[PDB]
Ligand binder design. Structure first.
Ligand code: NA
Ligand code: NA
Lengths: 415, 415
């Protein structure tokens, strides 16, 4: 018989702490209550690079509390933005967990990102062109390497059982956590800090995503633009985030008297082999990922009460994911799509949405999916909307999919 | 009794085909032959950006046969460099394995890289600065995304059991092979194309790496510059490469009639939590990676006949690595350092060197480490040199270490 969490095959792994910075708040708890009050982080873009380039997208969600307003002249010179965000959340998370003294030989870190420290690439490039090789920072390399944030967090908190950085574009935050759960259940570690980081909204990233027609242009109502599964959706809205969580065996937590917020039960990772940016319309492979997170957890489709959807709010994207949920036998679960209020944080998004899945299992509630005003016939899912819905949610799947056809599903439980 | 490969805990995994392009040959069997004949792939840099930027480093090993000389006008505009390298090697490896017909849903891809399609970032940046947002191509995100090369190979070959990209700098290509094994013995896959690809020697990469002052500046004698474990080493040499290997269950391979070139038995991934770019002096966490690989393969250190050494030819790296080999208790092993001849390929190197470890095992011979002319006392390793060294090699560890504090060790065995 194949091992699973349920049959004692895998060690029990629990979530003991979470941390996030959102367009709604620097505090995950304030964001949670903000989401439950039906609030949106999406505002009008006020950065002068908007009119300057007369961008077709003029809305989005900046962090409520700027990362760099916590960052010294040394950090600003020595780190890239993701590395700085990494330090912040990495710092904030450890205190939240009581600042545990762990055996770092049993302590890993896994944090994904969309690109890494890309501002440092263009800077180093501008400088070399104007003043040559000597103008390049001796720290250019470590600031640019996309494993930069993870390495910073590993060094910062002291992890010596591996610092890993999975990249799969928009599912990097989920895959980050899925690999942290593997390192643990395979005997490589006892505890791990995991999640995803990502950079702030800028001109170049808007242009690149706009030129694919992937982004909403409902500029005149910033808070109505992001409409996952709504019949009138027209693409995603940028919504800056960063998120981390602490996971450890249920016995490691027990020992240090740590109260688990939820359980991480299993992880599924598949691929489409279909298109470089378009999701496979049939949802089969994405649905296989959900199934696979279930098999490792020892749960059946019927067991799943909630589904935190990727829900980017694009026509083919939300439609492909509706099919995915039906292949997985999970179309009778209560569905929520956080991007309705928090936008798309690319590499961070999956990890932020994983913390929301955990807060749903802890608190027994699902926030309303914003802007869900016209059910799309093709979708046909139980989209929680209008009000927060309460129930004894016991099992949930967090979904995330990236460009390259990456499908990451995480099985969660209530502690 | 925890699972090992020897005790039955894990499925048996075999390497059934390999492919590599280097500074010596576009052909892995001809690179091997020249490496044994005592060939260097390093030469004088004749690119005009060399004089233009007056760079302190004017030596490196360009690819014997340029990737773009095999790429049409279509591929040249729809892919970044590393995507185009991966397409070439993916298709080269596939045929070398016989163009197998495998279950797509049990077929995975894990390829590591240093940063991704970075040339496309600076191109899109120049384009926008010069003609605005609509001068960014709709294909830029898929060309830039760090997972791009792996996605391209997964689309190309049809990998629907996961397409992953681990990034850990210089160990990226080793860690990818690590994660494919994991992926198979965890039962998410039965066959996996895996390794690393990397971009070419270019002006801005040289500038950035020599600003850290860790590059050899021995431009008068390109072939004698990369001197790992030599007392008179002065930093690393760029040597271009990309490489892939095909792994599968011994059962999957027997059922299609593939001849295993070696076995993949285990892997260990740890981290130093010491410095952002420098390895830990004591080599402890690094040795621990090696140790972890043996614990999983079911081997004692006394069984390891040969260590394929990261051996970057920097003072502190070689010094730290020798200590890790003693921590691992593998100091009686025959040590080869391939960078002495083929140079450093960053994201691709650990994969290239994993392929070499397989040819050592298969052909029961080790090539000479070039330039090893003065034994450095502190080092104290049995380094192969002068002439290749034949012998009865049954097991071997391949070491890869990366900026950010990463240590990857892979345990291989003769089939
Ligand atoms: Na989600
Ligand atoms: Na090596």
């Amino acid at each position: 018989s194949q091992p699973s969490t349920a049959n004692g095959g895998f060690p029990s792994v629990v979530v003991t702490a979470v941390t996030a910075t959102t367009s709604i708040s620097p505090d995950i708890e304030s964001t949670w209550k903000g989401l439950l009050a039906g609030e949106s982080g999406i505002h009008a873009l006020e950065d002068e690079f908007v009119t300057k380039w007369d961008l077709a997208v003029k809305i989005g969600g900046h962090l409520k509390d700027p990362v760099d307003s916590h960052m010294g002249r040394l950090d600003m010179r020595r780190m890239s933005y993701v590395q700085r965000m990494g330090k912040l959340l990495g710092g904030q998370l450890w205190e939240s967990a009581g600042s545990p003294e762990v055996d770092p030989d049993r302590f890993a870190v896994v944090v994904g990102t969309g690109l890494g420290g890309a501002e440092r690439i263009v800077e180093s490039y501008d400088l070399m062109n104007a003043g040559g090789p000597r103008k390049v920072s001796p720290l250019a390399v470590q600031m640019i390497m996309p494993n930069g944030a993870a390495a910073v967090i590993g060094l910062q908190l002291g992890a010596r059982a591996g610092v890993m950085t999975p990249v799969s574009a928009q599912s990097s935050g989920s895959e980050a956590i899925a690999h942290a759960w593997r390192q643990i259940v395979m005997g490589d570690a006892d505890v791990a800090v995991c999640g995803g980081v990502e950079g702030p909204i800028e001109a170049l990233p808007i242009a690149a995503f706009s030129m694919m027609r992937a982004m909403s242009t409902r500029n005149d109502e910033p808070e109505r633009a992001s409409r996952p599964f709504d019949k009138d959706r027209d693409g995603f809205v940028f919504g800056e985030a960063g998120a981390l969580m602490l996971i450890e065996t249920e016995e490691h937590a027990k020992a240090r008297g740590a109260k688990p917020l939820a359980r991480l039960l299993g992880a599924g990772i598949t691929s489409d082999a279909f298109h470089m940016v378009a999701p496979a319309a049939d949802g089969v492979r994405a649905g296989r990922a959900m199934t696979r997170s279930l098999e490792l957890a020892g749960l059946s489709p019927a067991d799943i009460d909630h589904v935190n959807a990727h829900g980017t709010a694009t026509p083919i994207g939300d439609a492909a994911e509706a099919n995915a949920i039906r292949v997985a036998g999970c179309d009778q679960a209560a569905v929520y799509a956080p991007k309705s209020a928090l936008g798309h944080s690319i590499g961070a998004v999956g990890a932020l949405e994983s913390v929301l899945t955990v807060l749903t299992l802890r608190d027994g509630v699902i926030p309303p999916t914003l802007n869900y005003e016209t059910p799309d016939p093709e979708i046909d899912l139980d989209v929680v909307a209008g009000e927060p819905r309460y129930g004894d949610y016991r099992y949930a799947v967090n979904n995330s999919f990236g460009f390259g056809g990456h499908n990451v599903a995480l099985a969660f439980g209530r502690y």
